[PDB]
């Protein structure tokens, strides 16, 4: 009964396959909000698309609380569970 979400955040890494950057997109935003909180980082370095995708997706959430973030984060790591099959 902790950040089981943070446990999902492990699963999504174990998926037999680096999910599609677009599903990663969502996962990041909720993940990052839940673990970090209201984005204190900058827009893209070495991986533009990616860099913002994560930044941008999260940045979208800034203001939302860690747990709400979890609720959907988790449910979305859940999607990988199926998409890829962990
Ligand atoms: C469209 C671009 C991504 C959308 C925004 C970020 C997505 C984050 C949510 C999903 C987490 C990644 C899911 C698995 C993806 C892969 O597997 S791709 C890497 C090759 N690895 C594998 O196949 C095995 C598992 N992978 C890994 O352990 C890492 O390489 C990992 C995927 C976690 C990170 O690699 P990658 O996505 O290629 O680039 P990063 O910039 O290093 O990470 C993406 C962003 O997500 C944050 N992050 C790191 N680890 C996680 C986990 N476990 N869950 C969720 N989010 C994670 C990073 O902080 C990074 O964003 P930023 O902070 O902006 O750089």
Curated annotation (Swiss-Prot):
Post-translational modification N6-succinyllysine, affected residues: 7, 16, 54, 76
Bridged cysteine pairs (disulfide): none
> Could you tell me which species this protein originates from?
Bos taurus (Bovine)
InterPro entries annotated for this entry?
A: Acyl-CoA-binding_prot_CS, Acyl-CoA-binding_protein, Acyl-CoA-binding_sf, FERM/acyl-CoA-bd_prot_sf
Q: What is this protein called?
A: Acyl-CoA-binding protein
Chain segments annotated as transmembrane: none
Give the lineage: Eukaryota, Metazoa, Chordata, Craniata, Vertebrata
Localization of this protein: Endoplasmic reticulum; Golgi apparatus
Q: Which residues carry this modification: Phosphotyrosine?
A: 28
Binding annotation for an acyl-CoA: 13, 28-32, 50, 54, 73
Which residues get modified to N6-malonyllysine? 54
- Record key words, sorted: Acetylation, Endoplasmic reticulum, Golgi apparatus, Hydroxylation, Lipid-binding, Phosphoprotein, Transport
Q: What is its main location?
A: endoplasmic reticulum
């Amino acid at each position: 009964s902790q950040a089981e979400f943070d446990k999902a955040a492990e699963e999504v890494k174990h998926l037999k396959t680096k999910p599609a950057d677009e599903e990663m997109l969502f996962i990041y935003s909720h993940y990052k909000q839940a673990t970090v909180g209201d984005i204190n980082t900058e827009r893209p370095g070495m991986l533009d698309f990616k860099g913002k995708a994560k930044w941008d997706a999260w940045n979208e959430l800034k203001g939302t609380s860690k747990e709400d973030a979890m609720k959907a984060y988790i449910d979305k790591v859940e999607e990988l569970k199926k998409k890829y099959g962990i």
